[PDB]
Amino acid sequence: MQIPASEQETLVRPKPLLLKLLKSVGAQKDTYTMKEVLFYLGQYIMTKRLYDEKQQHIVYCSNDLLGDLFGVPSFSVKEHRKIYTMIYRNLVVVNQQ
Numbered sequence: 001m002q003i004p005a006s007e008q009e010t011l012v013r014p015k016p017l018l019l020k021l022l023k024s025v026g027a028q029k030d031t032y033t034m035k036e037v038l039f040y041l042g043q044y045i046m047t048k049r050l051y052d053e054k055q056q057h058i059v060y061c062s063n064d065l066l067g068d069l070f071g072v073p074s075f076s077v078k079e080h081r082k083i084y085t086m087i088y089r090n091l092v093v094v095n096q097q
Ligand SMILES: CC(C)(C)NC(=O)[C@@H](c1c(C(=O)O)[nH]c2cc(Cl)ccc12)N(C=O)Cc1cc(F)c(F)c(F)c1
Pocket: 003, 038, 039, 040, 041, 042, 043, 045, 046, 051, 059, 077, 078, 079, 080, 081, 083, 084
């Protein structure tokens, strides 16, 4: 639940499945900052109503594309590093020159 600000601005290119997910919720770019990826994934979770209705800080992503991407049935929204790691496996970090 704490990512350095420098890492939040890291430029990334999502792989096809994550890209298609992001474009369904209003994102149109092919290159993002991690800050942008996290925002649009949070919007996707809201749109697909994947957050726990009982408000116990858990996303239920089983049998949804997000669960396919993350490789988990569910996860805690309080564990930012583990969420970043799951997202990192679905993108390429843009090389800096
Ligand atoms: C589940 C709902 C919809 C209620 N959203 C959240 O609670 C959630 C959130 C956001 C956001 O705000 O935009 N974007 C996400 C993407 C995913 Cl996969 C999961 C959770 C979130 N969150 C907010 O505090 C926690 C959070 C904020 C960050 F900044 C992070 F890096 C992080 F790992 C976790």
